[PDB]
Amino acid sequence: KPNYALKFTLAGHTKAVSSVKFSPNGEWLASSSADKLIKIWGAYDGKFEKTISGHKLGISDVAWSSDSNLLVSASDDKTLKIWDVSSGKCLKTLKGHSNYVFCCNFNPQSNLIVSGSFDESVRIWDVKTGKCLKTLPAHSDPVSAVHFNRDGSLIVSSSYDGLCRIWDTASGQCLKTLIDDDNPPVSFVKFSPNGKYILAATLDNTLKLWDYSKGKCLKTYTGHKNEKYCIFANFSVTGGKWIVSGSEDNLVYIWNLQTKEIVQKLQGHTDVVISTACHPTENIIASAALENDKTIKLWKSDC
Amino acid sequence: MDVFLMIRRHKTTIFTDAKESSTVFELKRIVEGILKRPPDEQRLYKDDQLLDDGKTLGECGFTSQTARPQAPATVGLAFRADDTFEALCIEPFSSPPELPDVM
Amino acid sequence: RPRPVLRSVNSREPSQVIFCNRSPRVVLPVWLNFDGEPQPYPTLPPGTGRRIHSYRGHLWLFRDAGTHDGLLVNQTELFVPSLNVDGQPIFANITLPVYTLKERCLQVVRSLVKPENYRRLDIVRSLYEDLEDHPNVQKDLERLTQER
Amino acid sequence: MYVKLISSDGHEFIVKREHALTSGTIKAMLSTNEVNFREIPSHVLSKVCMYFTYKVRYTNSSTEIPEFPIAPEIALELLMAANFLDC
Numbered sequence: 327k328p329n330y331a332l333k334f335t336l337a338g339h340t341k342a343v344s345s346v347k348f349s350p351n352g353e354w355l356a357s358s359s360a361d362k363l364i365k366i367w368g369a370y371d372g373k374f375e376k377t378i379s380g381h382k383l384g385i386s387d388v389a390w391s392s393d394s395n396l397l398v399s400a401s402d403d404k405t406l407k408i409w410d411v412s413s414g415k416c417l418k419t420l421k422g423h424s425n426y427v428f429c430c431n432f433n434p435q436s437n438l439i440v441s442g443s444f445d446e447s448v449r450i451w452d453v454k455t456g457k458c459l460k461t462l463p464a465h466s467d468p469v470s471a472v473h474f475n476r477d478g479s480l481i482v483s484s485s486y487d488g489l490c491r492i493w494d495t496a497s498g499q500c501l502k503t504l505i506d507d508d509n510p511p512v513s514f515v516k517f518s519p520n521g522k523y524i525l526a527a528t529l530d531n532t533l534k535l536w537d538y539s540k541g542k543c544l545k546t547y548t549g550h551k552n553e554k555y556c557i558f559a560n561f562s563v564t565g566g567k568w569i570v571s572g573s574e575d576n577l578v579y580i581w582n583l584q585t586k587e588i589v590q591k592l593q594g595h596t597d598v599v600i601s602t603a604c605h606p607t608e609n610i611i612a613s614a615a616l617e618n619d620k621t622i623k624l625w626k627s628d629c
Numbered sequence: 630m631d632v633f634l635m636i637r638r639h640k641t642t643i644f645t646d647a648k649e650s651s652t653v654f655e656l657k658r659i660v661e662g663i664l665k666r667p668p669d670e671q672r673l674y675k676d677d678q679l680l681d682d683g684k685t686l687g688e689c690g691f692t693s694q695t696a697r698p699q700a701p702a703t704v705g706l707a708f709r710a711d712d713t714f715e716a717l718c719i720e721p722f723s724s725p726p727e728l729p730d731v732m
Numbered sequence: 733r734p735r736p737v738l739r740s741v742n743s744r745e746p747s748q749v750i751f752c753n754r755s756p757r758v759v760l761p762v763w764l765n766f767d768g769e770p771q772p773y774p775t776l777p778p779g780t781g782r783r784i785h786s787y788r789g790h791l792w793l794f795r796d797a798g799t800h801d802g803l804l805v806n807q808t809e810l811f812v813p814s815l816n817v818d819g820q821p822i823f824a825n826i827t828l829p830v831y832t833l834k835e836r837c838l839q840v841v842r843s844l845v846k847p848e849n850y851r852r853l854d855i856v857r858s859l860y861e862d863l864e865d866h867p868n869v870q871k872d873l874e875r876l877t878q879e880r
Numbered sequence: 881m882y883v884k885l886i887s888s889d890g891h892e893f894i895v896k897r898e899h900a901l902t903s904g905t906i907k908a909m910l911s912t913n914e915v916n917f918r919e920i921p922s923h924v925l926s927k928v929c930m931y932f933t934y935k936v937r938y939t940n941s942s943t944e945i946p947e948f949p950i951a952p953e954i955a956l957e958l959l960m961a962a963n964f965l966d967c
């Protein structure tokens with residue numbers, strides 16, 4: 327069992343914080359917020375580094391390029407933006423979605439961006455030109471999460487229609503769907519770091535670990551509260567192997583991946599913890615909460 | 630096509646229904662059932678116009694659009710006994726008081 | 733005894749409906765969510781109708797949008813979409829109830845008098861209270877609950 | 881069968897019995913086939929009878945129902961009468 331304890335609270339945003347992401351080089355934490363701003367903080371000491379502005383409405387998500395030089399943001403203003411982190415420059419504005427853009431991710435090569443929108447499409451974008459390369463509209467309700475696999479050959483998307491969809495990146499064709507006996511909205515999905523599994527959240531207070539090669543659900547994590555908001559979950563693999571997620575009771579929940587036992591509940595936030603992130607090399611968790619809270623918290627553990 | 634009527638004489642008003650295809654005479658038969666005067670002792674009117682017994686209510690102007698349950702059309706009634714004809718005479722209803730200030 | 737929460741069943745089974753406003757009022761459709769809470773939807777002018785997407789087992793009520801007077805749909809208070817058959821939409825025919833004369837009079841007097849002024853009228857106190865007891869979806873929720 | 885409802889100012893309104901029995905008050909007063917109202921005047925009672933016709937015609941009719949119109953000048957007295965008649 328880990329012993330995460332609070333180390334820093336980052337109170338720079340003036341509205342709900344929607345997403346926190348550690349840079350792949352481990353140096354930085356990027357936060358996005360309903361206050362239309364991205365902020366960059368020191369990953370280890372929570373020291374404010376810079377503010378990145380340009381979006382006209384609130385921001386739902388941010389993601390780092392593999393070399394930690396670029397950010398992409400997803401916004402209520404229907405656009406994504408590609409930013410140079412060192413300069414804070416908006417390099418590109420990706421236009422094509424017809425409603426709120428909720429989620430975004432680079433592929434490992436970082437030549438592609440995947441996005442997901444309330445307009446029920448997943449889009450694949452060229453980083454160099456900013457042009458939309460493919461639109462995948464098979465989902466029949468808002469797309470809540472998009473993620474590339476380890477080599478970028480697959481995309482997994484989750485949607486309020488109750489499906490996870492695995493897409494072939496090259497062709498755009500949906501290679502597989504994943505769904506249990508019931509169809510609650512799927513609020514979050516991501517490939518495991520190791521590449522073998524997919525972790526999916528549903529709005530029935532449940533996280534599930536799937537063998538997507540076999541279409542088999544391997545594990546199930548409950549005890550938290552998740553019926554309304556799309557809460558980002560994570561694999562923690564730098565020490566022990568944990569599942570980490572926010573919760574609608576304002577806590578961060580940590581489960582043992584194999585036993586599915588809750589091993590920790592981190593208290594401190596005063597609203598829905600909508601986002602969690604796990605540091606790439608150290609046992610550090612970042613968490614972010616909604617409107618009654620507006621802060622990011624950094625927690626650290628020996629394992 | 631139904632029509633809804635007020636048949637009015639003096640201080641008496643009969644509420645009844647008929648059809649656009651009903652004749653004036655049929656109306657008189659309805660009236661006879663109630664007031665116990667035969668059709669040949671009745672004259673029916675629309676405004677100041679004596680209605681011909683053989684005309685249908687539609688041919689006289691009573692349509693479903695202007696003779697509604699909630700806003701019936703008025704037929705005047707006057708009686709006749711042998712050689713004495715009673716003139717059409719309908720007493721108006723009371724009048725509402727001055728609309729109150731808060732309205 | 734626990735009293736049934738009138739609520740939409742979350743069936744996730746789509747149903748296409750024609751909201752037909754056969755009334756002289758501006759109509760506010762009211763959807764009961766899965767928690768039983770009323771949610772107002774866009775309004776329909778008199779004499780108009782709209783094809784709309786809803787779901788099997790969802791619950792709808794219909795009011796006057798300006799006054800919240802209660803209205804009927806297919807001759808009753810609640811509309812529940814079912815499964816479409818043979819590619820045919822489900823009609824939700826929204827009409828005026830036959831109000832009591834008293835309630836219709838209350839409607840007209842309320843439309844003419846500011847609530848603050850009700851008790852200036854030269855009428856008995858119980859008519860003041862009747863005027864002040866404005867139409868309310870919650871009344872119908874409570875009644876239809878006590879009927880089930 | 882018909883009944884005669886007589887206004888305070890002496891106007892007689894002859895209406896179908898079934899229509900008049902819309903009002904439980906009128907039913908109590910019928911227990912002659914005539915009812916004398918001591919205070920409801922003719923302009924109000926005529927409107928009440930029109931309401932009776934409208935009510936019986938459109939009740940449970942599965943059709944489009946028109947508004948029952950009430951002029952402002954009559955509304956307060958019509959309210960008083962509808963309350964007394966419980967209709």
Ligand SMILES: Cc1ncsc1-c1ccc(CNC(=O)[C@@H]2C[C@@H](O)CN2C(=O)[C@@H](NC(=O)CCCCCCCCCC(=O)NCCN2CCN(Cc3cccc(-c4ccc(N5CCN(C)CC5)c(NC(=O)C5=C(C(F)(F)F)CC(=O)N=C5)c4)c3)CC2)C(C)(C)C)cc1
Nearest residue numbers: 342344345360384385386428468556774784785786787790
């Ligand atoms: C013509 C007209 N004229 C007369 S009438 C009429 C008419 C017009 C239209 C219609 C349409 N038809 C209906 O509406 C029918 C009628 C009736 O039958 C019901 N119904 C339905 O369609 C219903 N649908 C169904 O019955 C089947 C499908 C419904 C899904 C089941 C929902 C399960 C319950 C959960 C719940 O209760 N949610 C309530 C609260 N949520 C909050 C979010 N809302 C918005 C939303 C919806 C979907 C996705 C996301 C989403 C998802 C993910 C993310 N991010 C992902 C990445 N993270 C990192 C961050 C989060 C974000 N983003 C954010 O949340 C966000 C921020 C933050 F993260 F900080 F919050 C900040 C920010 O700046 N921007 C965004 C947002 C957000 C939705 C409600 C319903 C849609 C009304 C519910 C019908 C008639």
Ligand code: NA
Nearest residue numbers: 799801839840
């Ligand atoms: Na009204």
